[PDB]
Amino acid sequence: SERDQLYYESYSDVSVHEEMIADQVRTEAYRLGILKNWAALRGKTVLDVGAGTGILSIFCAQAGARRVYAVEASAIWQQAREVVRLNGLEDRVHVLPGPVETVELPERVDAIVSEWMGYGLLHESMLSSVLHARTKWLKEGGLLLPASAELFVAPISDQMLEWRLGFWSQVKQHYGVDMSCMESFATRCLMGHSEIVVQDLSGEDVLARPQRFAQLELARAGLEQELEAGVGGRFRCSCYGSAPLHGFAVWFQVTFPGGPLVLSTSPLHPATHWKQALLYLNEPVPVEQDTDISGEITLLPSPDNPRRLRILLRYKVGDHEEKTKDFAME
Amino acid sequence: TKSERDQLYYESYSDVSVHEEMIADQVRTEAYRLGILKNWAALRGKTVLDVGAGTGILSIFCAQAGARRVYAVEASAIWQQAREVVRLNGLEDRVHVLPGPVETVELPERVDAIVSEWMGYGLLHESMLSSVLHARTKWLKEGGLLLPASAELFVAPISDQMLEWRLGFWSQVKQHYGVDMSCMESFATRCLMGHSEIVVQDLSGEDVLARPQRFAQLELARAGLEQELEAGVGGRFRCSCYGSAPLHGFAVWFQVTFPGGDSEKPLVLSTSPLHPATHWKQALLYLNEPVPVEQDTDISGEITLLPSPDNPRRLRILLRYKVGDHEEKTKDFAME
Ligand SMILES: COC(=O)c1cc(O)c2cc(NC(=O)NCCCCNC(=N)NCC[C@H]3O[C@@H](n4cnc5c(N)ncnc54)[C@H](O)[C@@H]3O)ccc2c1
Ligand SMILES: COC(=O)c1cc(O)c2cc(NC(=O)NCCCCNC(=N)NCC[C@H]3O[C@@H](n4cnc5c(N)ncnc54)[C@H](O)[C@@H]3O)ccc2c1
């Protein structure tokens, strides 16, 4: 309650809603994903879980929803009421303040729309709120937007990290002072920790074919029990070539029903504010073409904080013995 | 507490990231390189104290400039890496890395010169200045050399184009997505401008609304400078706007100046938005809301850099200001 209240009012500031709507890959994907469901939303009722400024609710109205209930727990709900009023939709889009867990809707709804994903998919873990509203207020077999999330893992050779490690071998060319001996210290500092690092990679950093290691269907009942215990699964892949293996990037996509539109955070797709979630090994591990990497990745809430993402990594490079690493978000 | 702050600072400077930023800062590292090498005559065969040596790169520049002995004093765990950096370049006979605070180090001798890179954001936030002044009094010989010799503080009124774009962003949602969100503008201004925090951000010359005014100078060689630091480094200013724009507030930045010696022309390391970027960026002091001004609009007031009452290392800035015919206003800022 102390946490929930502190977590909600982190969204009472403009900067995080600005960043979300300024992410055009995200916002266009949601806009299209909603509008493309015009046939299934037309004449139907909708619950926007965590409506924020209310922009997703208004796309739902544009898709022909007859009513949208925009439920928002933080102070930003006042802005959304004015946005709705300003767009002339106060008769069809109803901003209700409070947590979706305890708000009273006038009715069960035909559809849920929500943008609930955090870093590494489940950090902040608003997903439990969405699934709570599904059970309580979505009608049987009702539409969820997006409908599902897919998790991906790929082994990586991070060019940024390389450049930072090799920075110390370059100081001589720049200023006449040799500093190559700092490299191992830079390695321990940048890789030896146990934090999930949130950073933008590109296709150049991907060391093998991405593997989908879990799918979460939002419409599947009892998925709330699974989240507390951890979701994820196993993977196996083979390296493209020779490079220092730095670890793994984890990312996700969300899929809207076809009416199929996919919002991807892959480093092979245009960048989003989510970037990717990097799991560095303690030190770089040389690999070559067809090196076999297998393992298991599990996304869990942290013991100390149920909204903080933790990731249990088990891996095995070639024949170098199975290792594990325990990661938590900063 | 102080033990909380000191442990957070040990841990920070014991980590590679902050040193990578300072050395990657080519404007800074190169100025110090030229500023030191330019003073070879003063430094040839003399002794040097490097206050806060970090990785030792400044102590090595000193040895490269002809110094016979350099004491490279560094309080964080990074002293161990600097010891290896000195050994790698074959300098451990001339450069001695000593761990710990400069306040408690014991040198074998007093020194001919002090070099230090001690400047925080807005010059004095997190400042190692008091460490440098303490080493000056205790270890520098009479008439010894200080590198850099001085710092100067500058203020300018600003129309921050990036801030403008964030303020107008909500007015541009409809053209992009069909949803009118221009009612958000007032709310965004309150968030982005209504706080009392100093914001550290890069600006360009396009942001500077009037001639930058130097309002203070710090001459490191002056004994009893220490008393001015606790009461306030500050000064008064007046300027006239270049043209029409919304006035968002003021930018504060600094330069430091190395003595000429061989060339007599003084090398300046600048953090002005008119000069190449550095990691110090600028300290922005936003008004509660934009104020429209035009060509030759008068702007005047007083700026005082102070320590915060709760934390002496945390920079506080008192801004008193007057825009044209508006009434004088004040706003009290602290670093986040
Ligand atoms: C100086 O600053 C820095 O340096 C900084 C550092 C960062 O690390 C920064 C990180 C950022 N990124 C970030 O924060 N999030 C990116 C993904 C987030 C995941 N959440 C999500 N999808 N958003 C929509 C959620 C909306 O639903 C509401 N809601 C929640 N539960 C509810 C419930 N039960 N009932 C009703 N309403 C509920 C919320 O109130 C909100 O309106 C941004 C800025 C950052 C800045
Ligand atoms: C037993 O020791 C502990 O447990 C300890 C105790 C402290 O109280 C600590 C206090 C710190 N605070 C601090 O650095 N604030 C500055 C922030 C902006 C300005 N920085 C800048 N422009 N360049 C930094 C250049 C290098 O100067 C070193 N240094 C700093 N002050 C020093 C001193 N008195 N003597 C010797 N070396 C000192 C740093 O470590 C750094 O590498 C850090 C670490 C500390 C460690």
- Amino acid, single-letter form, for residue A142: G
Atom 13 of ligand 1, nearest CA residue: A16
With CB atoms and an 8 Å threshold, state whether B177 touches A27.
yes
- Structure resolution, Å: 2.3
- Amino acid, single-letter form, for residue A179: M
Establish whether the linkage from the previous residue to A146 is cis, with ω within 30° of 0.
Answer: yes
Q: Are residues A136 and A211 in the same domain?
A: no
Q: Are residues B96 and B213 in the same domain?
A: no
* Phi/psi at A261 (5° precision): -95, 130
Asked if B260 and B268 touch (Cβ cutoff 8 Å), the reply is no
Q: How far apart are CA B135 and CA B103, in angstroms?
A: 7
Atom 17 of ligand 1, nearest CA residue: A118
How many CA atoms within 13 Å lie on the side-chain side of B42?
24
* B169/A contact by beta carbon, under 8 A: yes
Q: How far apart are CA B323 and CA B293, in angstroms?
A: 8
What contacts B141, CB < 8 A, 6 or more positions away?
A: B110, B111, B112
Asked if A186 and B20 touch (Cβ cutoff 8 Å), the reply is yes
CB atoms within 10 A of CB B8: 9
Q: Which two tokens stand for residue B67?
A: 């110094």
Q: Which two tokens stand for residue A126?
A: 């608003």
* Phi/psi at A33 (5° precision): -60, -35
Q: How far apart are CA A169 and CA A181, in angstroms?
A: 8
Closest CA to B121 of B271, B294, B269: B271
Breaks (C-N over 2.5 A) in chain B follow: none
Residues of B in contact with A53 (CB under 8 A): 181, 184
- Whose tokens are 């503080």? That residue is B153
Which string of b and e fits B182-203 if b means at least 16 CB within 10 Å?
A: ebbeebbbebbbeeeebbbeeb
Q: Is the CB of B25 under 6 A from ligand 2?
A: no
3-state secondary structure of B144: strand
Phi-psi region of B77 (alpha: psi -120 to 50; beta: other; left: phi over 0): alpha
3-state secondary structure of A35: helix
Domain end call among A97, A131, A149: A149
With CB atoms and an 8 Å threshold, state whether A171 touches B26.
no
Asked if A327 and A295 touch (Cβ cutoff 8 Å), the reply is no
Q: Are residues B87 and B200 in the same domain?
A: no
Query: In sequence order, which ranges of A138-197 are alpha helices (DSSP H)?
Result: 159-165, 167-175, 183-191
Catalytic hit among A19, A82, A104, A124? A124
Give the gyration radius of chain A's Cα atoms.
22
Atom 9 of ligand 1, nearest CA residue: A16
Q: Which ligand is nearest to the CA of B132?
A: 2
Q: Is the CB of A116 under 6 A from ligand 1?
A: yes
CB atoms within 10 A of CB B174: 14
3-state secondary structure of A62: helix
Q: Are residues A138 and A222 in the same domain?
A: no
Asked if A271 and A25 touch (Cβ cutoff 8 Å), the reply is yes
Q: Which two tokens stand for residue A168?
A: 């110390």
Q: How far apart are CA A208 and CA A223, in angstroms?
A: 30
Asked if B273 and B288 touch (Cβ cutoff 8 Å), the reply is no
Query: Helices A183-191 & A167-175, crossing angle to 10 degrees?
Result: 140
Residues of B in contact with A189 (CB under 8 A): 15-17
* Phi/psi at A89 (5° precision): -115, 15
Closest CA to B38 of B153, B149, B120, B128: B149
Closest CA to B280 of B315, B326, B248: B315
Q: Are residues B101 and B247 in the same domain?
A: no
Q: Which ligand is nearest to the CA of A96?
A: 1
Q: Which two tokens stand for residue B131?
A: 């460490």
Atom 16 of ligand 1, nearest CA residue: A118
Domain end call among B125, B151, B177: B151
Catalytic hit among B21, B126, B152, B226? B126
3-state secondary structure of B235: strand
Output the CA–CA distances (angstroms, integers) from residue B85 to A199, A308, B18, B100, in the order listed: 30, 39, 17, 17
* Active-site annotation holds for A124: yes
B200 alpha carbon to ligand 2 midpoint, in Å?
20
Atom 4 of ligand 2, nearest CA residue: B10
- B224 labeled part of a ligand binding site: no
Chain mean position to CA A290: 30
Residues of A in contact with B64 (CB under 8 A): 176
With CB atoms and an 8 Å threshold, state whether B85 touches A179.
yes
Greatest CA separation for chain B = 73
Annotate A64-113 with DSSP letters as a single string.
T-SEEEEEE-STTHHHHHHHHHHTT-TTTEEEEES-TTT---SS-EEEEE
Query: Burial level of A324, CB count in 10 A (0-12/13-18/19+)?
Result: exposed
What contacts B280, CB < 8 A, 6 or more positions away?
A: B119, B121, B200, B253, B254, B271
Phi-psi region of A203 (alpha: psi -120 to 50; beta: other; left: phi over 0): alpha
Q: How far apart are CA A12 and CA A76, in angstroms?
A: 5
With CB atoms and an 8 Å threshold, state whether B191 touches A31.
no
Q: How far apart are CA A147 and CA A298, in angstroms?
A: 21
Output the CA–CA distances (angstroms, integers) from residue A299 to A233, A306, B115, B315, in the order listed: 9, 12, 50, 41
Output the CA–CA distances (angstroms, integers) from residue A58 to A127, A256, B231, in the order listed: 22, 17, 55
> Which residues of A contribute to the annotated binding site?
17, 26, 50, 72, 101
With CB atoms and an 8 Å threshold, state whether A27 touches B179.
no
Residue B201's DSSP bridge partners are: B282
Q: Are residues A198 and A309 in the same domain?
A: yes
B103 alpha carbon to ligand 2 midpoint, in Å?
11
Pairing of strands A148-156, A211-217: antiparallel
CA distance B190 to chain A (A): 9
User: Which of A3, A72, A103, A330 to mutate to test ligand 1, by most ligand atoms within 8 A of the CB atom?
Assistant: A72
Q: How far apart are CA B106 and CA B85, in angstroms?
A: 22
Residues of A in contact with B89 (CB under 8 A): 177-178
Residue A19's DSSP bridge partners are: none
Domain end call among A119, A149, A179: A149
Q: Are residues A68 and A136 in the same domain?
A: yes
With CB atoms and an 8 Å threshold, state whether A177 touches B89.
yes
Q: What angle do CA B201, B204, B208 make, to 5 degrees?
A: 100
CA distance B77 to chain A (A): 11
Domain enclosing residue A22, as ranges = 1-149
Q: Are residues B276 and B163 in the same domain?
A: yes
Q: Which ligand is nearest to the CA of A101?
A: 1
Closest CA to B326 of B300, B288, B296, B303: B300
Q: Are residues B300 and B208 in the same domain?
A: yes
Q: How many domains does chain A have?
A: 2
Atom 39 of ligand 2, nearest CA residue: B52
Residue B146's CATH number: 3.40.50.150
* A171/B contact by beta carbon, under 8 A: yes
CA distance B284 to chain A (A): 17
SS3 per-residue string spanning B176-229: HHCCCCHHHHHHHHHHHHCCCEEEEECCCHHHECCCCEEEEEEECCCCCHHHHH
3-state secondary structure of A167: helix
- B103 labeled part of a ligand binding site: yes
Q: Are residues A130 and A174 in the same domain?
A: no
* Phi/psi at A212 (5° precision): -80, 120
- The secondary structure element, H or E, covering residue A127 is helix A127-137
Catalytic hit among B20, B117, B185, B289? B117
* Active-site annotation holds for B20: no
Q: How far apart are CA B190 and CA A276, in angstroms?
A: 32
Window 181-220 of B, Cβ < 8 Å to A: 181-184, 187-188, 191-192
Residue B216's CATH number: 2.70.160.11
> Which of B179, B185, B187, B336 would best serve as a mutation to test chain A binding (most A beta carbons within 10 A)?
B179
Q: Are residues B135 and B159 in the same domain?
A: no
Q: Which ligand is nearest to the CA of A6?
A: 1
Annotate B30-70 with DSSP letters as a single string.
HHHHHHHHTTHHHHTT-EEEEET-TTSHHHHHHHHTT-SEE
Breaks (C-N over 2.5 A) in chain A follow: 259
Q: Are residues B73 and B87 in the same domain?
A: yes
